[PDB]
Amino acid sequence: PRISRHRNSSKTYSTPKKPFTKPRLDAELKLCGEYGLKCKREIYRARYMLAKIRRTARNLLTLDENDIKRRFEGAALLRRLHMLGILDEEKDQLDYVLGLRIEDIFKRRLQSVIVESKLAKSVHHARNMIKARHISVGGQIVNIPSYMVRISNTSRVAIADTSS
Amino acid sequence: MPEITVKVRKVLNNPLLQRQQCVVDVLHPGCTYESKEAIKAKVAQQLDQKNIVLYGFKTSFGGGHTVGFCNAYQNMDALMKYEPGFRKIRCGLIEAPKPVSRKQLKNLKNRRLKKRGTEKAT
Amino acid sequence: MSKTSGLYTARKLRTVRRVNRWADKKYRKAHLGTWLKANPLEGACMARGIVTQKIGPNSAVRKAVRVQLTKNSKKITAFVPRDGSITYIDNNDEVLVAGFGRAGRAVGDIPGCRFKVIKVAGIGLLALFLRKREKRAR
Amino acid sequence: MARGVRKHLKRLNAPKHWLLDKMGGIWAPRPTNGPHGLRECIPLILILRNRLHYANTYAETSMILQDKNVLIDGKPRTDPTFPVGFMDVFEIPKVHKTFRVLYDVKGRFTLVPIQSNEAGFKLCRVQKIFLGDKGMPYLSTHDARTIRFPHPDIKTNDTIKINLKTGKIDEWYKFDIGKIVMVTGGRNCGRIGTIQAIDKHMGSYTMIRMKDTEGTEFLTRLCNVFVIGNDSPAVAIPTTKGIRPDIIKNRELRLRSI
RNA sequence: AUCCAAGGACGGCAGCAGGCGCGGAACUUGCCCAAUGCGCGGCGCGCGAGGCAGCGACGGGGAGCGCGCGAGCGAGGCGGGCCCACAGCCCCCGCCGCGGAGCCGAGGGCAAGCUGGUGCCAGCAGCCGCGGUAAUUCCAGCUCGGCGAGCGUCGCGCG
RNA sequence: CAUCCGGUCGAUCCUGCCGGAGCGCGACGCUCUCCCCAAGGACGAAGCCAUGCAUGCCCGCUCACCGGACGCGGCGGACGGCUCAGGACAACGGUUGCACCCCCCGCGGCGGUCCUAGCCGGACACCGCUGGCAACCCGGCGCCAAGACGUGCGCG
Ligand SMILES: [Mg+2]
Ligand SMILES: [Mg+2]
């Protein structure tokens, strides 16, 4: 058959089981306003990633410390988290992972990292400039607002050289 | 007009096919190289200007970086013997015959198979 | 106890569950086959038939129609939802008929009605109710 | 139930250690019959195209092979699907490159460049001693090579050194405890060790226990145990002396290389 | 089931396109062997396998209908590259420049309320129930709520 | 990634079911700015089919025409592609065996053959002449080739 049949694909978010819940609606609108989220799918994506990390951490934590698999997977997970900036450098024990929150994920988005550097007035202004390709990471320009920057790349973010 | 730099990578010698393997990276930050023909010279001096073929070439997001492949042949005949026809046609080497529809060819083949003995009439 | 619990008793538990799972009404309906043969739709989401007669603690006369399924040739009764939609339905006309919310059982105060009209002459009934489409071809 | 033999091979059904890409295409090359079978071999084109990168397509490989630029044990081969196997000689005179085909610790085929002093021979494993026509004794090897009138002292599972120029035995290594061996199949492919025990079960497989030089111990069946000399290897071996690293060590190596 | 100059001859699409019937339900009677392979072979031929394109709201992923007190940016149009067996498409370089939201609902379960008609009629309502002169539930306008380039209805499976 | 809510009464506690709330597979309705990926006549009709295509290649044999046609010969066509009717200790999955078995190509060996050999014999194909038949199909005579056919030199 066609080779295209063997390509993979998957969903990336989870919907709440109870849709109408006043505190949840308030919190979601609050988060959307602070971080300028386009719609409610981004929150679901963040929840999905957080759930994956939490499940991995749980499964690893259920085992003994001196287990080869536990060491291997914990080291990999901690290295990934440190590189991505979600978890602080000084934390190296697996326990700290389970207390993480989606706000930490959100704070590393491109809009946030340029706003905290004072290069933009607001998250909405940041999104407007990003869509207009006026920003660059390292030597390359990125026009995706959800692009996630790494800790070693935070100081290399600047304004696009060719931007007017 | 910011200058343009061409480098040479993945250098391999292929005496069997009488050529050299290649991967060309051209840097034109804030500008565009006119095309491949005007850039043949850089690769030529880095490694006759008509014994080189550039076929792979993609420009990355933002236009800063463009990479590709070249193929330098020892002699013109080696290029002629070892080269896909469409590559020659794209280059200014030979002339492309007018295309003919394969459907008509299949129709002719079936009609000919229909006849017996001497079937050259149709 | 009241259930067998020995280490070599898997067969008895299997047969017990096999026999006793047939007492649930829903499971019987789903996996017995009588419902499948009795259901006019024959397990389909909706069917196509032909109109043959327009007919009628709450005391509210309701408008419905008699249909004859093309693929099965049996007779059923269908109900026309919206307000004033009976005029869009003419005697001897082809319709598309679906089910109600409940699969099989009657819905609401309508006695013995389990089917709904949704399309007439190839145009959605609800669309015609809002004037999105028009029946000037008929 | 197919009416005859099979001639094609789907890409997904191909052996894993070939390392073919899932999206490269629907089909994969189907090796022809020869010295080595389907599951213990590798087609020539894969080496000539996906490893040494000397060719970019099927047609280039076919042209090269027709020009007789590749030798396999001194005999030019023009078949793009000729099967190559363990302890083969792969010399390309036009570029003065000579390799021997062996197994890496990960369990894949590798090319080990060699010298001329040891490139005129190969090692073969004897699997069968039978009487042919007229009662003349014979022997067969893992590469589908039959020798007549062999020395009586040679038995099954031994190792034989045959000169490629003529095809005659010069010396043999007995199968015994304390002889360096190399594993040619299973979970332990590519490891090097020394035999320590031989346990035979009547009517079933015979099990061989060997210890690695570092001190590791592992088990495998006799069907894939290959003697490669006495105490020390007779031939060259890859840089690592058949030592399989652990996942953690391999991850450290990967990070160092990154 | 087909041709017949009536004595005769002739077929098997559950192969690729396409047509009829059936059904609730399902695409072009297109181009090419250039890539992966097979067959026969020395500097290649053939392949409706396969590849490319077309229709395609099955479905999945990423951006947007503004920001701020002036600029800027897309979609789109015209040319040049790159790619392509040939053509597209993506991406890059120049000139000019359309910013467009729907589907459900507002008594409870379940987040979201004021006027005008009708009068157990017409109609709503998965369940409870509303409607016999203020109808918080029908029909309309205003306002509001949820999801959002998607929303709702019907049947099946898990929960 | 361990959740419940409304309905039997004049009120209350239970059993018990009805309905709602989530995901996925399809069909219907309304609507749709840009890009990437992507399924697609299977659903008690394995029902019926105009029209075109889907299997060829070539070393051997040239007194054909100007060596290329055609023909004999060789290999392949038993692979690939489509569908799920039939079949319920069967097919199928894992695990054994043939000391009851067959096997083209390919690789490596081996190669002693009882009783004109400066190299044997006759044919057909294509083709020329002559003809039947609506078409499909073929007839009769005639010189010629073989890595074709037949005979066969040979250390049981
Ligand atoms: Mg057929
Ligand atoms: Mg004789």
For residue D135, how far is its CA from the centre of ligand 2 (angstroms)?
A: 27
CA distance B33 to B28: 7
For residue A14, how far is its CA from the centre of ligand 2 (angstroms)?
A: 91
For residue D3, how far is its CA from the centre of ligand 1 (angstroms)?
A: 20
CA triple D211-D214-D218, angle to 5 deg: 30
Q: Answer for A14: CB within 7 Å of strand F.
A: yes
Is A1 part of a structural domain of the chain?
Answer: no
Residue D102, C-beta contacts closer than 8 angstroms, at least 6 positions apart: D86, D87, D109, D110, D112, D237, D238
For testing the chain B interface, which of D52, D54, D67 should be mutated: the one with the most B CBs within 10 Å? D54
Owning domain of residue C48: 1-137
CA distance B113 to B98: 26
Q: Answer for D76: CB within 7 Å of strand E.
A: no
Residue C19, C-beta contacts closer than 8 angstroms, at least 6 positions apart: none
Q: Which of B5, B14, B77 is nearest to B48 (CA)?
A: B77
Q: Which of C28, C57, C33, C55 is nearest to C43 (CA)?
A: C33
Quick check: A161 and B61 CB within 8 A? no
Owning domain of residue A69: 19-164
- CB of C98 closer than 8 Å to CB of C107: no
C96: β partners: C48, C119
CA distance D72 to D52: 16
- CB of D173 closer than 8 Å to CB of D227: yes
Q: How many CA atoms lie within 13 A of A137 on its CB side?
A: 19
As a whole number of angstroms, the longest Cα–Cα distance in chain B is 71
From the number of C-beta atoms within 10 Å of its C-beta (0-12, 13-18, 19+), residue A56 rates as middle
Q: Which of C22, C24, C93 is nearest to C54 (CA)?
A: C93
Nucleotides of F under 7 A from a protein CB: 1, 3, 18-24, 26-31, 37-40, 44, 52-54, 56, 69-71, 77-80, 82, 97, 104-110, 126-127
- CB of D180 closer than 8 Å to CB of D227: yes
Q: Which of A123, A152, A157 is nearest to A138 (CA)?
A: A157
D2 close contact with A: CB closer than 8 A: no
- CB of B26 closer than 8 Å to CB of B39: yes
**Sign of the alpha-carbon dihedral angle for C91, C94, C100, C106:** positive
D53 vs B contacts (CB less than 8 Å): 12, 21
Q: Which of D40, D41, D15, D37 is nearest to D28 (CA)?
A: D15
CA distance B68 to B24: 5
Read off φ and ψ for residue C118, nearest 5 degrees: -135, -35
CA A96 to chain centre: 17
Q: How many angstroms separate the first and last alpha carbons of chain C?
A: 73
Domains of chain B: 5-91 (3.30.70.3370)
CA distance A117 to D236: 60
Interface present between D and C (3 or more CB pairs within 8 Å)? no
Q: Answer for D186: CB within 7 Å of strand F.
A: no
Give the CA D99 to C1' E35 distance in Å: 30
Q: How many angstroms separate the first and last alpha carbons of chain A?
A: 50
CA triple C80-C83-C88, angle to 5 deg: 60
Q: Which of A43, A16, A19, A20 is nearest to A101 (CA)?
A: A43
CA distance C16 to C138: 61
Where are the domains positioned within chain D?
Answer: 2-117, 122-172, 175-244
Tell me which residue has tokens 């409610």. Answer: A40
Is A8 part of a structural domain of the chain?
Answer: no
Quick check: A140 and B30 CB within 8 A? no
Technique employed here was cryo-EM
CA separation, residue D1 to residues C54, C68, C123, D152 (Å): 61, 49, 52, 46
- Count up the domains in chain A and report the number: 1
Residue D227, C-beta contacts closer than 8 angstroms, at least 6 positions apart: D125, D158, D159, D173, D175, D179, D180, D181
CA separation, residue D97 to residues A41, B19, D61, D71, D113 (Å): 58, 18, 17, 11, 7
Q: Which two three-digit tokens encode residue C129?
A: 């109710």
- CB of D207 closer than 8 Å to CB of D219: yes
- Count up the domains in chain C and report the number: 1
Q: What is the DSSP string of B43-97?
A: HHHH--TTSEEEEEEEEPTTSSEEEEEEEEESSHHHHHHSS-HHHHHHTTSS-PP
Is A3 part of a structural domain of the chain?
Answer: no
Neighbouring CB atoms inside 10 A of C51's CB total 20
Q: What b/e string do you get for B103-122 counting C-beta neighbours within 10 Å, with b at 16 or more?
A: eeeeeeeeeeeeeeeeeeee
CA B9 to chain centre: 19
- CB of D79 closer than 8 Å to CB of D65: yes
- CB of D65 closer than 8 Å to CB of D77: yes
Is A2 part of a structural domain of the chain?
Answer: no
Is A41 part of a structural domain of the chain?
Answer: yes
Q: Which of D134, D167, D171, D133 is nearest to D151 (CA)?
A: D171
Nearest residue, CB atoms, D95 vs list B15, B21, B82: B15
Q: Which of C61, C113, C125 is nearest to C88 (CA)?
A: C125
Distance from CA of D185 to the nearest CA of A (A): 26
For residue B114, how far is its CA from the centre of ligand 1 (angstroms)?
A: 19
Neighbouring CB atoms inside 10 A of D225's CB total 23
B59 vs A contacts (CB less than 8 Å): none
Q: What b/e string do you get for D37-70 counting C-beta neighbours within 10 Å, with b at 16 or more?
A: eeeebbbbbbbbbeeeebbeeeebbbbbbeeebb
